[model samples]
Target: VVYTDCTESGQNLCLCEGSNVCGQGNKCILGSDGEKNQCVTGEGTPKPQSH
Candidate 1:
């Protein structure tokens, strides 16, 4: 399995099975390290940040 770093927002941010990328509201599931994760919205709707 692949692991990614969690976003600064303290949310999961990694691509996992079922989902190609981290959904809007769903955070990535990181291990004990808590470093490999991503930030996800709670509404399921992805609110992309404006660059």
Candidate 2:
């Protein structure tokens, strides 16, 4: 598991991007952002979820 934070100023918003491969039957759990094309995950599961 991993966590990251970014900051952006002006008319555009900062973006957080990442790539990961799940092992066996495992999956990736993405985080949430207020902007579009952002990723988000559930609190307790590794399943990818959208917000």
Candidate 3:
């Protein structure tokens, strides 16, 4: 999120290309920490499954 919203990439030029979930090309699966499902893009904090 922050990585793609920074002033450097703030032009919104690096948006996620995948339609799976998270809008960041990540897969939505059960949470490993027993929390809500989230994106598995392994980039930032757990964001939850966009599916």
Candidate 4:
């Protein structure tokens, strides 16, 4: 899926714009080599609440 954001400017927003998003509640982040961007979570990201 192709994610997009008008604020992308010369390039894509480099961030998830929902719809064709990556992971749930996750945001797109710059990938390695500075040539790609994908939805990912950082170590700081909160995990799902367990019962």
Which candidate comes out best when scored by lDDT? 1
List lDDT for all candidates, in order: 0.45, 0.29, 0.34, 0.40
* Model 1 bad stretches (over 4 Å): 1-13, 33-51
> Which lDDT tens digits does candidate 2 get at residues 1-51?
453222321111123344432332332333345543333332223322321
Pairs that collide, model 2: 31-40
Superposition error at 49 for model 1 (Å) = 11
Q: Can you write out model 4's per-residue Cα lDDT over 1-51, one digit (the tens) per residue? A: 444432322232233444554444454554446645455544223222321
Best candidate (score: TM-score): 1
* Model 4 weakest lDDT span, ten residues long: 42-51
What TM-score does each of the candidates earn? 0.31, 0.21, 0.24, 0.28
TM-score, candidate 4, is 0.28
In model 4, the clashing pairs are: 16-28
Superior by TM-score: candidate 1 or candidate 4: 1
The C-alpha stretches of model 2 lying farther than 4 A from their native spots are 1-20, 33-51
Report the error of model 1 at residue 42, Å.
Answer: 3.5
